[PDB]
Design a protein around this ligand. Structure first.
Ligand SMILES: [Mg+2]
Lengths: 96, 78, 97, 77
């Protein structure tokens, strides 16, 4: 009984709204693989997970935390599907 | 699959002060359990130990979580 | 003793693929002027890959060795010069179709 | 607000040149082009190292700063 921990040392924030039970599913995978979930967009957040289009709020968030990465849920689903840390850059979110 | 579905349907309140809280939470959540916030604690199906104001819930313990995980299914409460 | 802004200091860039007209020369100028570091090849030091082309499979191979790489549009660098400050590269990112 | 001073100058700058990095930065910032050691013959100017290409204009770090001060090319020196 020893779970994989390739999300270890990474802090996530689930931003905006998620369809169906996706939020619960995201929380499950991040937690299982030893990632850290933050309640709010604070100084520790490294990855912002969003299913919504680029947001003006993102550019404000960047002001306080310039190293943030914005990623699709697909990234996390795919990490579980492959059971390893895949590169988030493959699943990034950028302005139109 | 790696993420066994063991605690499907279990809505558990886990006291933050529970020994080994973090690992308990991780494996319970990983294996398909749902945590309940203190605010909505009265809606839990299971409660850990020194419960209060939730009599109809099933009483469980940390040992019960590990027992369920070992057997890869829900076992008799304890 | 003229003094140029330093907003690119400590960052290593690689200009990937082909660039229209004199853009390559322009990018080289801004990166250099504002104290960025240009690399000749995609080596262990590269932090920002600048490309005007669509996402590339080569990007995924590079990520294998250098997992912290960021892929960015030239517009990021032009904008930094236009605003005379380090803007967030995330606003100008390059991702797969 | 970037001055175009070294427009048309193709310079070979020896890596061992004192203050190499600063020299490179301002020369390039102000519209000069550096040449790789292999493309030596394509250089219009060469700093220090005279032997490498006698046919090219011989310059020095002082000449780079002199040009910048005058905001135009001065005589090679
Ligand atoms: Mg941390």
């Amino acid at each position: 009984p020893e779970l994989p921990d390739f999300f270890e040392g990474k802090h996530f924030f689930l931003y905006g709204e998620f369809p169906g039970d996706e939020r619960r599913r995201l929380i499950r995978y991040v937690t299982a693989f030893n990632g850290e979930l933050e309640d709010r967009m604070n100084e520790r957040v490294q990855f912002v997970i969003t299913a919504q289009e680029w947001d003006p709020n993102f550019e404000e968030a960047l002001m306080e935390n310039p190293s943030l990465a914005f990623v699709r849920p697909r990234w996390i689903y795919s990490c579980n599907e492959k059971q390893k840390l895949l590169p988030h850059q493959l699943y990034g979110v950028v302005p139109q | 699959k790696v993420l066994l579905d063991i605690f499907t349907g279990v809505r558990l309140y886990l006291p933050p002060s529970t020994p080994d809280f973090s690992r308990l939470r991780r494996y319970f959540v990983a294996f398909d359990g749902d945590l309940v916030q203190e605010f909505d604690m009265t809606s839990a199906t299971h409660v850990l130990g020194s419960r209060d104001k939730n009599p109809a819930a099933q009483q469980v313990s940390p040992e019960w979580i590990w027992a369920c995980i070992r057997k890869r299914r829900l076992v008799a409460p304890s």
